[PDB]
Ligand SMILES: Cc1ncc(COP(=O)(O)O)c(CNc2cc3cn(-c4ccccc4)nc3n(O)c2=O)c1O
């Protein structure tokens with residue numbers, strides 16, 4: 100593939116740090132080397148000495164004197180080597196990407212640890228988007244993505260979707276305005292990429308099927324666009340097993356995948372990872388180098404130590420317990436919606452994640468009913484407006500999270516909503 | 528001050544996330560509220576339970592069950608409130624900025640925690656720079672800043688400098704190409720900003736005097752440009768007292784200051800902070816919101832707990848012990864250079880920081896000596912090329928860090944350097 104056409108002039112202009120050549124020559128010189136090269140501060144000046152972190156339950160992560168000095172010091176831009184190698188093997192085990200052994204220039208599978216998956220996505224959007232470029236996505240979409248794309252000056256083209264996510268026939272119809280050969284044409288503006296959240300879309304809770312992913316991938320090949328697979332709910336699917344990902348079917352090296360530890364390990368530690376073709380991942384790493392430099396070494400070492408002790412089996416057993424908890428939370432929110440909202444609202448059973456997307460029946464805009472009337476009654480939900488490119492347009496939808504509230508709290512919240520629907524209906 | 532004229536259309540287009548709006552109406556409603564509006568994962572699913580971190584020396588930082596759940600959860604984009612308030616008070620005590628009580632629109636002093644000071648600088652450059660803009664700086668300059676500015680398409684104008692940093696007469700001569708009234712002219716390209724490292728410039732080690740800062744500030748007012756004060760060695764000055772900063776003389780609200788904890792507390796934790804006018808700090812926070820979201824909550828809580836227990840006095844006492852250690856390292860590197868390099872190289876005594884900037888006599892380019900010959904002999908130093916806009920031009924300079932090597936290691940390293948210089952001197 101020609102990666103240069105999916106890279107801005109600014110992104111292509113990025114050069115590596117002078118410390119890259121120094122690290123490459125460090126592995127080509129003697130063993131007992133003296134370095135006065137790096138701008139590394141003295142680790143003995145740091146006030147934190149050792150650390151003990153207890154793990155669920157009875158287990159213990161310990162940072163001795165030397166490990167603590169490493170944790171408090173600068174580390175590689177793409178992430179610590181032990182976390183990268185464990186994650187690489189996880190990706191091979193979970194997705195077996197076709198690109199593992201491709202030459203670097205042909206999109207060889209590459210990884211980098213990011214400060215949450217949001218950082219990876221942002222660098223990816225900034226690497227690709229020139230003002231006026233065309234991008235594809237299905238609305239309602241994650242507000243963070245829309246807020247990230249809005250300043251970039253791109254035209255966002257909405258792809259139709261249903262309970263099984265993106266409708267491939269709608270994507271087929273949209274793309275028919277171009278001819279496949281337009282992707283090679285400098286005077287044509289064929290879409291740079293398709294962005295999607297394939298499992299438990301934020302805010303709908305809907306997931307793509309394997310069949311639909313195969314059809315979407317074939318259209319991405321035909322019109323030569325990238326697939327940005329933002330999958331933070333991959334490890335939060337309600338069904339047993341896992342639907343094959345876009346990365347698993349990536350024969351062309353056209354998929355950039357974002358994974359997150361936010362919903363399973365910790366959101367506050369800011370650790371996620373990007374998997375994709377080496378020429379694109381390299382552009383992202385060069386941008387990280389001049390911004391955050393690297394993700395927290397301390398946080399990476401905590402997660403790396405946990406993952407190595409658990410192994411892939413202990414990791415998957417932990418995700419299984421997390422899924423079990425969210426599955427019960429999902430049943431409790433569905434039971435509250437059944438009790439109070441039957442006849443008043445419409446909702447689908449979410450396939451993954453932590454949200455219930457509710458459509459209020461005889462109301463055009465839910466914003467004032469929620470942002471004002473519901474708050475006064477002691478209940479807060481998110482109005483749907485925030486999940487569309489045109490956020491000023493009226494929305495009868497609301498997003499309700501089932502991650503934290505108790506069944507009794509959900510019952511209170513839904514009873515209130517039901518009376519406010521009956522209130523906004525009897526108004527002349 | 529007209530802040531919109533300094534920023535890009537993309538930066539001005541940034542909008543806040545909806546989670547800020549929901550928090551604004553949270554305090555505006557009852558106390559025992561049920562909120563299904565948020566997107567926070569359930570914290571009880573996170574595998575880390577408690578933490579104990581030992582501090583220098585005999586002291587301990589503890590994260591109980593509830594504090595650990597906070598540390599592992601999402602937190603505000605600008606930083607945790609207790610770290611922000613402690614940092615705000617430190618800035619007032621150290622710099623007493625003239626803008627503390629200005630209205631928000633007039634550049635009221637504002638702060639935000641960043642994932643290292645490099646993130647703050649990068650967001651600041653991205654917020655300001657349109658291709659073709661003129662920017663001022665003194666070369667040799669920090670490689671990270673040059674590598675960051677290079678993709679932005681700006682014209683970098685070199686300001687002459689000496690052992691006391693930027694020469695105000697050179698800045699005066701450069702600016703004379705414009706008339707002060709051109710700064711109000713949209714069709715003129717007057718400089719957007721002056722960037723400088725006022726204490727222990729990376730790589731020279733040179734520091735600006737108070738008198739030079741006052742003259743530079745007056746030129747910044749006359750031609751209406753911003754001052755980007757990148758000061759990571761502010762807490763690493765070898766001279767007695769601290770030279771007043773650009774922020775301390777900032778009557779106009781034209782200074783953006785970057786501070787770093789990398790050289791004093793931890794480089795690996797990725798915690799720094801930006802201080803500047805509220806309209807500009809807000810644009811940076813809005814960009815952080817779509818990228819890293821926030822700095823690690825865990826890392827901020829560790830630093831915040833340490834700073835609150837130390838107090839500002841304990842913090843300043845720690846910086847004194849750090850300066851004392853680097854002052855001794857500086858004497859050891861100067862003694863090693865005197866012994867091995869006299870007649871072979873030239874160097875100035877650094878005023879602050881951790882680097883010795885060495886000019887090799889009789890050689891035009893030190894790159895092959897440093898990147899190949901020295902590495903093979905087991906010694907690493909940085910060639911000077913990386914500190915200039917034109918990195919391909921030959922450089923007789925090298926940067927040697929005195930932060931980590933022992934006096935015995937410096938002696939070995941410089942004996943090797945002397946040997947290689949001698950070898951080069953004999954080749955005709
Ligand atoms: C003027 C100025 N402005 C801002 C900052 C940024 O500081 P933050 O940490 O607060 O973001 C600095 C920090 N400088 C350096 C930081 C460096 C880090 N590595 C390194 C070495 C090995 C592995 C990974 C990284 N090597 C470094 N070298 O060589 C440096 O010079 C600065 O000097």
Ligand SMILES: Cc1ncc(COP(=O)(O)O)c(CNc2cc3cn(-c4ccccc4)nc3n(O)c2=O)c1O
Nearest residue numbers: 215216217241296301331359361371546565566601602
């Ligand atoms: C599809 C998709 N893609 C990527 C990501 C990013 O994940 P990372 O953490 O890996 O960067 C998500 C995460 N989503 C959300 C994250 C949220 C964080 N806060 C919050 C709440 C209070 C204080 C501070 C922040 N509120 C949030 N809300 O509302 C969310 O929906 C995602 O859903």
